[PDB]
Symmetry: D2
Subunit: 212 residues, 4 copies
């Protein structure tokens, strides 16, 4: 056991669940959040039967108050050392069929939410003097294809937040990273663990993984 | 001459004025747009003095209904052939001092507004079967520096919108372009004219200019 | 009215190169046009001269640094060298195990080495006049290396770096170094190079990508 | 042991030495090459006192015959499983001062040698049905600065070789990677160990590391 927490913002999918499993398996108390937090009960049982610690919460990440409360709670339980922001929103609409609602919603889910998760984690971590903030990217963080104006906009948006944060906070002992996924959920979790284990002398900001 | 309109969304600054001057000098009826639309009066004087046609309007680009009406007003006067989105927003705040309001407001001015201006320009131009949609970018569209989380996030976001639109609409005879600036505000207006003059067999999506 | 100036077109043997020569000659420059077999430039010379333009055709193997240097020195001696356009392609594809020592070396000599020498020697000549433009033709293989493209992409990436490094050094010294990436009509590429030529120093583009739709 | 060899081409610097020490400690038989192979004698003595296995050879990486013989020698000892190509050439000259001799020598040491190293490694590895081919890059692999025409040309060139080889060979079970440096040399060795440990479902092609 470590006297430390890991926040997994977006433990709904298999990737998010695997990240939770992995950091729990390594002795962190995992705070896991998804929209319908009752659906985390399978994951909790499995992790706790394996002897690991997890606090499951319902969380709409679009809501900045809930994100702040989620992260503050994690840090109150034990010092927050790692946040993994894992909130996707893969949608495709031709530009004319991209509504105001969809564009705003995707930004709120995939960019706005990551900004708030990143800022509030930084606030908690800088008080401890160390920490790691990891964001999940996609190929839409790198290039905007046809139909992906809403989605690529939010993912480019998140990438820029990660960059600016890294420029500011890497010199302040916070490892900001951006993992672009393009597999086993478990392989994504292993990749986050690999970023976690990097020493200060050789930190990677951006990594892309593909399955072969 | 000409029987067609140019919408210059962001005619408030020096760059926006010069673009309005340039496209009017080349025979287009320029629909200029800024916040305080009555501050366009010295520009409207100078342009009409030289024989150019200009319709000055108040415009808050964040408001999607105002943008839609602005672009519809331009098209109703003469077929809309060129939209140039040129909306500022250059701010710097450390991550912890980047407020909810700043982040959301910067996105609204610089990314959301660009998406609306773009999608609505596309609707109108596709009726005429041709047209050009140009977006002004910055170094912050390409990399996020320290303190630039809000601004870089929004410019990255605009880049992805421009990219996705280009992937879909360039095959449908609409030249979508993204002009990155690091000048003569007049030199920027010239660069846009270069992009306008390009034939369909040699269209550039992204062009970056800087002085020496 | 003739400009008292030359343009070196290194690689005037394809349609793109010929159109570049046609364009700069149409705008009043004397074009020095080089291809491996200079006698094959005879139709181009005839066409340019009948339209009122000036052109000197030479045989030039751009892998040969002595020939590149002599070609550029000759152009500058004629009239001040103002624009060099390096347009030496080489699109070839071989799986990695089938990419021979010969193919890899030759593609580098033609597409990268030749560009370095042309660039360096053009810079030497142009800096004496205090101005000039040095343009390099790139490809998508300048930006990413696909399967089978190890030799070609290596040389194109290599050319792009040379261009970047020359630009960082010489743009503040009044040389517009540029890199035009293509993937037409050939007349369109010439237009794009003319567009780059026309840019004022308050707004130069280093790299630009074009494609047809 | 691992009953396998690791070829370190460019073991004459501190980084090269550390890569050798690292893979030897993990039970590989390291084949270490540098221009004067007698200067590897201290490293051999250090690794072998620790219980590691290493063979030192003189190698001029510009010479394709020597590179091929080096890698054949490695594979003849035990299956070549990892090749790490690590031959730098960090020189700076203004363009007019970059001689024919310098531009060619730099390509020969830093690009040509890498190509031959990669092609020959792939030949040997494909016969065993697996392998990893790693290339050390620099910031000059990504952008060319003033004075770096020779170095950046060769480094860009090598990046491209790595890219093409990766596209072709990752589907055929060879992990090709490009580690961009910029720091302790042990940190570089650690990052290559990271890349070695990546499972097939989550391989990264390119990773940048820098110190903080």
């Amino acid at each position: 056991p470590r006297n430390a927490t890991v926040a997994v913002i977006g433990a709904g999918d298999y990737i998010g669940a695997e990240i939770a499993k992995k950091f729990a398996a390594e002795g962190f108390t995992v705070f896991a959040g998804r929209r319908n937090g009752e659906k985390l009960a399978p994951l909790v049982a499995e992790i706790e039967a394996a002897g690991g610690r997890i606090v499951a919460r319902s969380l709409d990440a679009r809501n900045e108050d809930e994100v702040t409360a989620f992260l503050n709670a994690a840090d109150a339980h034990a010092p927050l050392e790692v946040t993994i922001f894992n909130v996707g929103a893969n949608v495709n609409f031709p530009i004319l069929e991209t509504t105001d609602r969809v564009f705003r919603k995707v930004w709120e889910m995939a960019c706005w939410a990551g900004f708030v998760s990143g800022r509030e984690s930084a606030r908690l971590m800088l008080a401890h003097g160390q920490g790691k903030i990891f964001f999940t990217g996609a190929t839409a963080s790198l290039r905007g294809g046809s139909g992906f104006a809403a989605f690529a906009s939010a993912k480019f948006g998140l990438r820029a937040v990660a960059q600016s944060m890294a420029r500011e906070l890497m010199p302040k002992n916070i490892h900001v990273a951006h993992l672009i996924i393009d597999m086993p959920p478990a392989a994504v979790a292993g990749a986050y663990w690999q970023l976690y284990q990097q020493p200060k002398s050789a930190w990677t900001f951006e990594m892309e993984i593909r399955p072969y």
